[PDB]
Design a protein around this nucleic acid. Structure first.
Ligand SMILES: [Mg+2]
Ligand SMILES: [Mg+2]
Ligand SMILES: [Mg+2]
Ligand SMILES: [Mg+2]
Ligand SMILES: [Mg+2]
Ligand SMILES: [Mg+2]
Ligand SMILES: [Mg+2]
Ligand SMILES: [Mg+2]
Ligand SMILES: [Mg+2]
Ligand SMILES: [Mg+2]
Ligand SMILES: [Mg+2]
Ligand SMILES: [Mg+2]
Ligand SMILES: [Mg+2]
Ligand SMILES: [Mg+2]
Ligand SMILES: [Mg+2]
Ligand SMILES: [Mg+2]
Ligand SMILES: [Mg+2]
Ligand SMILES: [Mg+2]
Ligand SMILES: [Mg+2]
Ligand SMILES: [Mg+2]
Ligand SMILES: [Mg+2]
Ligand SMILES: [Mg+2]
Ligand SMILES: [Mg+2]
Ligand SMILES: [Mg+2]
Ligand SMILES: [Mg+2]
Ligand SMILES: [Mg+2]
Ligand SMILES: [Mg+2]
Ligand SMILES: [Mg+2]
Ligand SMILES: [Mg+2]
Ligand SMILES: [Mg+2]
Ligand SMILES: [Mg+2]
Ligand SMILES: [Mg+2]
Ligand SMILES: [Mg+2]
Ligand SMILES: [Zn+2]
Lengths: 119, 132, 146, 62, 161
RNA sequence: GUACCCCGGGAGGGGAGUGAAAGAGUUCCUGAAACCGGUCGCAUGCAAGCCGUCAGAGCCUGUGUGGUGAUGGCGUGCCUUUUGAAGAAUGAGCCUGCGAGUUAGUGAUGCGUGGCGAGGUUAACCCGUGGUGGGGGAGUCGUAGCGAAAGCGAGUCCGAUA
RNA sequence: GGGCUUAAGUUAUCCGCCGAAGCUGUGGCAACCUGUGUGGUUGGGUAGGGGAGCGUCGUGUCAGUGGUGAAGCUGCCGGGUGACUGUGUGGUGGAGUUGAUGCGAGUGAGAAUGCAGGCAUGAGUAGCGUGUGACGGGUGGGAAUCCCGUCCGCCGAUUAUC
């Protein structure tokens, strides 16, 4: 029962070389280099899937800060005022408002202002 | 399989467009040295190409010229086109069989010598197809 | 999907800051913020959404302490013994544009886009600028309370 | 010395593409009865002649 | 099934080259298993696969195999399958107590049922056995068992209570 | 096993013929990868890059999915061996093929599972020239241990029938 | 790092915010324990232990299947938690092979300065092995390098002859 390796062996090679189908140089042509690069790509993508939450939250916070500073309020005071007012709209929707519906955002800024400690 | 139009060189080089082609296979010259002349000859009018290759100093100018002439002759026989209204639409060089040889070096060593070959393909079409 | 600006979607404005008696650091922070569009809700780090900043009276920039002589700016040509040093006071008197541009560049991300956005900072040591065709509007450096 | 690493395809092609020639230019024979291409400042291969249309001379009996 | 180890391959006695100084990997023979044409490491060598199954297990398995199709009513007993000389046609007609498919004909001895054996020999859907050679594989393989009267007598007399 | 015609000194090719198929044309079944190129789409000549990953405009295509991808963030190869290696420690130019825990014991010792069970099981060998089936209990393990042993025995040994 | 004393420095105090794969929210998967209708706890991992599987080849049986096109190769569109995969859909190919359940392995490679073959990199790069050739004509598809001739040069205790 002598078995030849090729039929079983080429499957993972085809898979890896398909996953490396935009890489530059040896990384898209040779199975060993493509395998190393796919190891790195998997590590990178797992890490960036977790870092995406923080990245998008940072972008939302920056946009909310910019839109609330045009109304004379800092981001920290705006967030504290929305917390005190009870309006639980998250930073994703707050940034969506700050871009698309700036009048609704300014009304929310007024709501946050009226709900500050003022002390 | 049981499908029509088995693949052919004409269908891949011309594909129902008027024109013709020629291939010189196993030319005992390296593919790079043939390409140095083929890059000059590609896209040119065929008669201008053969007259220029008559004067090109390179050794690969004599093979390629012949190929072009053969292509022109083919177009003058299967299509009725004249030589003066043909242009070299496509031109490329592929590698042929490379013979292995040994050159004896110093201190009992032998270095490897590769005798390379080339296949030269030239496809000619009427000049009216240059912009179409 | 979070909003992303499209190429030339966000309009870029022209501003003129009067740097008379304005601290170099305050002016540089404000200019870097304006150049990168950090004051806009449509901000994007990868798309240039910033404005054009003109700074006049760049020779009258205020420096505290002994900075006009003791605060040094260095350059090196790369060949040995090729270091030159000047003071920020002499830079402001001689090449105010270079001084303001160095201060601003130190305050931006080290990028290709930042090198493109620094080209929007026009600096003049005198009170006048040649950009009246672009109608720069006055900008006042101000702080928001609390 | 000896190459430390295999040259990349980009760099190899960058250098190799500059190994190229130029096309020979060629000029029409001034002889009306020849009209064949030859090299500039060179006698015509087809008629062996040289000179302007007015004053031709034979350089090669070929 | 046999293979050659590195010691059984032709040649390979001498060291291919020096241990040090050549710039090549260390090799001790040309027939080392990583060489093309070298020895095989753990390839097959001749062996026997017969197992020392206890007798009680073999007998019980044959019993259960027979009972499975005694309860399925696929066991038939006949006096014979043929009269006189040896026809395959006649006992082919006779074995149509069921469909001629995966049948097993249990006859007695090599001589007491010479005619029946030679008749059923060529049916290719009939496996013919002597009663003393009843085994589990041929019974589990069969869809019907047709005993001859004397074949059943021999089997029952050989093994029983 | 390619008559004949065309370009060519030939090689080679183009028509044509044979053949079911010639891109089955003698380098002849199938014809992978490395590697070498022609064509088309996008990007690319102010830029610092383990070459990816996430965010993302634009263009092409739209076979409304796919190609490319300016630009922003994050990001120091693989293996071995080390307290510790991206390491300027080892090995590897690349691809294809091959290349390392196997087999034999009526071996030792466990476990799972099946048969039989105070019993279990055969070895050589014999019969089946029809095999994987049947016989063969010689031996062997369990059935009582303790003691150097004679021996005694649910006891035995050191001991004084302690 | 820019820049900072007009603190963006030290210090005391107060009010907010940012910030991890931590915790919470929501949607899947898995191990163990537990009452056995709540659920609870748990699931980073080298050496290493245990458990369960993917793929390759041969093979008993059953059901098949294949020139109305098997294997193998190569695309596209899909699927699973993984090894992987479709009984989707083409192309090439031209004679085998699929599923269920068992049985046996020469059963999986990225590395051993591993073995064989093929092909890159260096690179159209180094070298082309002491030197003297020039011209006229011929041959030829093609001539610095072949033939003939004339000049000239070279060896001549040897570049001769045996
Ligand atoms: Mg988080
Ligand atoms: Mg020698
Ligand atoms: Mg370079
Ligand atoms: Mg030996
Ligand atoms: Mg030895
Ligand atoms: Mg052998
Ligand atoms: Mg014929
Ligand atoms: Mg084919
Ligand atoms: Mg072939
Ligand atoms: Mg550019
Ligand atoms: Mg840097
Ligand atoms: Mg360790
Ligand atoms: Mg150490
Ligand atoms: Mg290293
Ligand atoms: Mg290194
Ligand atoms: Mg070592
Ligand atoms: Mg090395
Ligand atoms: Mg957690
Ligand atoms: Mg774990
Ligand atoms: Mg482990
Ligand atoms: Mg059929
Ligand atoms: Mg097979
Ligand atoms: Mg199976
Ligand atoms: Mg193996
Ligand atoms: Mg391999
Ligand atoms: Mg290797
Ligand atoms: Mg090369
Ligand atoms: Mg050169
Ligand atoms: Mg060089
Ligand atoms: Mg050189
Ligand atoms: Mg040289
Ligand atoms: Mg002579
Ligand atoms: Mg002399
Ligand atoms: Zn002329």
């Amino acid at each position: 029962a002598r078995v030849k390796r090729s039929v079983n062996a080429k499957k993972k090679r085809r898979e890896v070389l398909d996953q490396a189908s935009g890489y530059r140089g040896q990384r898209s042509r040779l199975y060993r280099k493509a395998k190393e690069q796919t190891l790195h790509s998997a590590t990178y993508s797992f890490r960036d899937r977790r870092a995406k939450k923080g990245d998008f939250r940072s972008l939302w916070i920056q946009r909310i800060n910019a839109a609330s500073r045009a109304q004379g309020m800092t981001y920290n005071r705006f967030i504290n005022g929305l917390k005190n007012a009870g309006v639980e709209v998250d930073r994703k929707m707050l940034a969506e408002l700050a871009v698309s519906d700036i009048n609704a955002f300014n009304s929310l800024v007024e709501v946050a202002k009226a709900s500050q400690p003022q002390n | 399989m049981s499908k029509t139009e088995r693949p052919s060189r004409r269908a891949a080089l011309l594909g129902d467009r008027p024109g013709s082609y020629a291939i010189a296979r196993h030319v005992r010259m390296s593919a790079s040295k043939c390409r140095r002349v083929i890059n000059l000859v590609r896209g040119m009018d065929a008669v201008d190409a053969v007259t220029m290759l008559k004067f090109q100093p390179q050794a690969a100018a004599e093979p390629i010229r012949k190929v072009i002439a053969s292509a022109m002759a083919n177009a003058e026989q299967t299509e009725g086109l004249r030589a003066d209204d043909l242009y070299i639409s496509q031109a490329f060089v592929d590698e042929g069989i490379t013979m292995r040889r040994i050159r004896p070096r110093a201190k009992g060593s032998a270095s490897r010598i590769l005798k390379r070959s080339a296949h030269i393909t030239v496809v000619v079409e009427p000049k009216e197809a240059r912009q179409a | 999907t979070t909003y992303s600006p499209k190429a030339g979607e966000v309009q870029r404005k022209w501003y003129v800051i009067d740097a008379e008696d304005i601290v170099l650091g305050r002016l540089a922070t404000t200019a870097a913020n304006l150049l990168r569009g950090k004051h806009k809700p449509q901000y994007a780090p990868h798309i240039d959404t910033g404005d054009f900043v003109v700074v006049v009276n760049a020779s009258k920039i205020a420096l505290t302490g002994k900075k006009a002589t003791d605060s040094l700016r260095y350059d090196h040509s790369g060949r040995p013994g090729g270091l030159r040093v000047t003071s920020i006071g002499e830079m402001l008197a001689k090449n105010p544009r270079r001084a303001v541009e160095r201060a601003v560049w130190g305050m931006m991300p080290k990028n290709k886009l930042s090198r493109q956005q620094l080209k929007k900072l026009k600096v003049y040591g005198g009170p006048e600028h040649p950009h009246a065709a672009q109608n720069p509007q006055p900008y006042e450096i101000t702080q928001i309370a609390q | 010395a000896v190459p430390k690493r295999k040259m990349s395809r980009s760099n190899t092609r960058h250098r190799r593409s500059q190994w190229k020639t130029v096309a020979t230019k060629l000029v029409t024979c001034a002889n009306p009865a020849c009209g064949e291409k030859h090299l500039p400042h060179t006698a015509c291969p087809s008629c062996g002649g040289y000179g302007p249309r007015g004053d031709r001379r034979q350089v090669v009996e070929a | 099934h046999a293979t050659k180890t590195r010691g059984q391959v032709s040649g390979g006695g001498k060291k291919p080259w020096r241990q040090k100084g050549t710039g090549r990997a260390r090799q001790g023979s040309t027939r080392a298993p990583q060489w093309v044409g070298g020895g095989t490491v753990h390839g097959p060598q001749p062996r026997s696969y017969a197992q020392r199954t206890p007798k009680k297990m073999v007998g019980a398995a044959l019993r259960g195999a027979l009972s499975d199709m005694a309860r399925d009513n696929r066991i038939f007993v006949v006096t014979s399958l043929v009269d006189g000389d040896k026809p395959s046609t006649k006992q082919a007609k006779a074995v149509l107590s069921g469909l001629a498919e995966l049948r097993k004909v249990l006859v007695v001895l090599d001589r007491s049922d010479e005619i029946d054996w030679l008749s059923v020999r060529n049916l290719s859907e009939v496996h013919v056995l002597a009663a003393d050679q009843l085994n589990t594989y041929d019974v589990v393989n069969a869809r019907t068992i047709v005993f001859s009267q004397a074949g059943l007598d021999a089997f029952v007399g050989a093994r029983s209570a």
